[PDB]
Write a structure and sequence with these properties.
The PDB classes it as oxidoreductase. Four copies of one chain form a homotetramer. The first copy, chain A, contains nine helices and seven strands. Chain A is of the alpha/beta class. Chain A has one domain: Rossmann fold, CATH 3.40.50.720. The first copy, chain A, is globular and about 60 Å long. Bound molecules: nicotinamide-adenine-dinucleotide (4 copies).
């Protein structure tokens, strides 16, 4: 089913979701390339992953870093079959509050970054007769989420980017889809005081926050050939956060 | 790698989409109950599946039936863990041309039908501590498709009914999502003029209609625990059809 | 500035959003034909509305009344230029707690009833050289709302069905759009527990339920020639109910 | 009808949609502050609009410029009651074809430009007790349109920026909606061979391209109190371009 024999570059794979996806894909047969700004950790992720993994330094906003890392894959593995655009920075504040400078920063990573990744990897995949680009968006890209400011703007952008890219590359067998994670447990969200566990996140239909491995599974599905006719699609992995409001809220929560 | 060891019932499982979902389910371990109105074929398909498959006549618009085949799976197999609502019919005419007689018929099978399946298996799956209901909607449920009238109206109804159900059953570990396949090659479509293969369906970004086995892959995945944090979702398997207009169309020509 | 000088039929016209529209639609100078099953109230309403109004009986489920009423509007006013599909019933219970007979009766009125209206009115408006059909869907037809069961199903139904009719009738200059009202104060919802007034409904961005006049104004925008290039569109009037979750919910309501 | 006895600022006011909105707003009784980079044409227009029009130079990507113009608007007309974020630039090329510096250029204006717009203008609106921000998006922000690249990513970003702002500014009585015009008759499109007139646009359900005033009419609606309950909505003025493919395309023609 969801098996591999390909080379997938994972951006933001030094930690959290990115590493998890790497771990899962390597565990599925793919040879991965981790790319992050977090070097020390990254190589540590690679080193633990095994021989199917290499770590590469990559600043998602620098076209040259992309060009170099994409090239490193073709050389070091023979091809580039998958791209998982995960690297990004978040926002937790009201619109008027956010500085235009920071707005611009966040939008650079989250949006313009996946674009540089796309246009850059596209030729390598054309070279390989098709490929899969999985754009990790957010639940903030599926509905208006209070307090996401620049992050909301950029996750909506990634959703349209995937879609229009999907219609342009279909004939080249280049698949492009977006995955949308809801509240996930990570030491970082743990720092927000987010508790993992059934009953611990009542404001999402499933009453709980998700796990990194849960989102990682859907990334692999879209990397595998079991989804050979899926493109310009959006997959929400949020325990129903974006589907509709919690019952309690429909009454008075 | 989406696995199984549970019992799932596949409505509309005689021929086409249903049968292949049944097929793929079995190859992953699931115990399947092909329910259908088409008794001869459906019985043969179960025959071709093996011991992992039971057939059951079921006219989806009959509450009594659903209660019977669910009961049967319960007794026959010890549980109900998956329900793939695929048994529908189709509308191939303009709205002003259609008779309220056919409209009622299409809606009744395509919409009310899945409602009953859902209302019936819910306790079955509460007893099992969770489940997965995959309502097979269509591209007609994701946009306005000319010539689908009742089939389309009912497919939007089915997309929506999947969502409100997901918010109510989240806490019960029951997961409702919708699969929306595009143009599939079927001897009927073949007859209706549909050619299978590359460049054989230019009016979809990917340039071809999908093989029935390409949809089935997506159904099996949402049935699996690989997607445990996935509810109130809508997956489209249509080679870009529903994402946006084809380049040529964007240009006119 | 929205103005009308044409004939328009409003279903569910005896009261609520329906009658409010009739008032405003006459204020804009249209000739309205109210239609309802509540004939006592209905005639009374048309009386208060004056001479630009005519009450006709219409059991939205009986294709005959549609014909009788559509024949009348044309003969009494020479043309049928608008149709506001407002008649409908509600649902407030957990899905698996709704009988299939009720499920069916609600769909019949909310879904098929708008269909019979579209088909019947089409030729009439074609003879008039165009027209405007406004289907009063719901905020329940824009996301998965809990406890709406049948009402949800049909509302998603009414939304998708407007889109195909829009694509089909676009060249006949017959415009079709759907209006989606969120929580609104109507004496019926009063007999629900709903309150009109500031902060009285904290679970929608704006803080309170809307008034009937807020909805009618929109229906009239789309019923007018100001929205001449508008078809296949969905206008939510719900104080952001549908737009995304409330700031409080977003933080741990 | 829609009356606007208030003061609203229009970006990209020198020409096109911006201008046609200015005329209709001033006609609705609004006091207008046109803003743009094209000082030459901008001045002329304001003049031709009357003593209810003022032209302010404003480069949409510069905060000082915004800070300046909104201030001037407060002094001059005593308040800021509306904002139509219309300034922007387009794109006509394949993603893999467009440069990073260009992508940036375009995002900055269409997305970042609207952010600084909203941020700056919010305090003025709280001051007044409410307001209406109309973010002019595009059909490109509602689906995957090929060749829009940076324009498409930014118009999708604008769609979600508006929705999040609306959840956060609900109780402040500041409404935020997105207008999404499709193909429009404009000498720009005209140089492209786009002919105005019925039948002249096959690939849109309505069989033709729209006029600026058709879109200008929706702006005045959202800006007016007539839409006091609309927030976080999206309105497509596009002849059904976004609601499913054209019948011909459905029939594989
Ligand atoms: N719970 C969540 O954290 C959550 C919620 C919703 C959506 N998501 C999406 O899932 C993705 C992964 O979530 P996460 O918690 O693992 O995030 P994370 O922040 O823990 O990890 C993402 C990685 O991106 C890296 N990165 C940042 N800037 C970079 C740059 N410019 N170049 C290269 N790499 C860079 C970071 O250094 C980090 O290690 C996120 O990007 C987010 O958009 C996450
Ligand atoms: N245009 C299309 O055909 C199309 C496109 C996309 C998705 N789909 C989806 O798949 C289904 C149609 O299935 P298909 O295309 O594989 O072929 P199909 O139309 O042959 O349907 C599959 C089965 O449903 C059965 N069925 C009909 N009425 C039934 C009833 N009342 N009770 C039980 N079973 C019944 C049929 O006999 C058949 O065995 C629909 O549910 C639809 O959502 C269809
Ligand atoms: N009020 C809200 O908050 C709200 C929200 C979303 C959607 N809606 C929808 O708006 C429409 C009605 O709004 P309302 O507030 O005026 O409600 P209402 O029910 O108070 O009044 C509308 C009318 O529907 C009529 N009706 C029912 N069956 C009929 C039939 N068979 N033939 C003819 N008329 C029939 C009733 O007689 C009634 O006069 C319905 O579709 C409702 O579902 C209302
Ligand atoms: N063919 C079209 O013109 C067309 C069609 C559909 C949608 N749209 C969209 O609708 C809006 C207006 O369309 P239009 O028909 O008026 O097109 P237009 O390009 O003639 O007008 C856009 C205006 O933005 C101004 N502008 C650019 N950068 C600016 C900045 N930095 N600060 C201030 N002003 C700036 C331009 O100089 C121009 O006057 C745009 O956002 C556009 O994306 C345009």
């Amino acid at each position: 089913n969801d098996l591999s024999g390909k080379t997938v570059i994972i951006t933001g794979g030094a930690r959290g979701l990115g590493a998890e996806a790497a771990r899962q894909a390597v565990a599925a047969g793919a040879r991965v390339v981790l790319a992050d700004v977090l070097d020390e950790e990254g190589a540590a992720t690679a080193r633990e992953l095994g021989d199917a993994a290499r770590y590469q330094h990559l600043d998602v906003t620098i076209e040259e870093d992309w060009q170099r890392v994409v090239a490193y894959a073709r050389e070091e593995f023979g091809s580039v079959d998958g791209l998982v655009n995960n690297a990004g920075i978040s926002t937790g504040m009201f619109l008027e509050t956010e500085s235009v400078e920071r707005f611009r920063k966040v939008v650079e990573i989250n949006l313009t970054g996946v674009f540089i990744g796309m246009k850059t990897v596209i030729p390598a995949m054309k070279d390989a007769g098709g490929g899969s680009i999985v754009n990790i968006s957010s639940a903030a890209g599926l509905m208006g989420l209070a307090l996401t400011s620049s992050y909301g703007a950029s996750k909506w952008g990634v959703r349209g980017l995937s879609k229009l890219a999907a219609v342009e590359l279909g004939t080249d067998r280049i698949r492009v889809n977006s995955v949308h994670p809801g509240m996930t447990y990570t030491p970082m969200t743990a720092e927000t005081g987010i508790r993992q566990g059934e009953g611990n996140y009542p404001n999402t239909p499933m009453g709980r926050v998700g796990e990194p491995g849960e989102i990682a599974g859907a990334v692999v599905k879209l990397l595998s050939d079991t989804s050979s006719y899926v493109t310009g699609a959006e997959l929400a992995v949020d325990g129903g956060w974006t589907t509709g409001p919690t019952v309690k809220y429909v009454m008075g929560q």
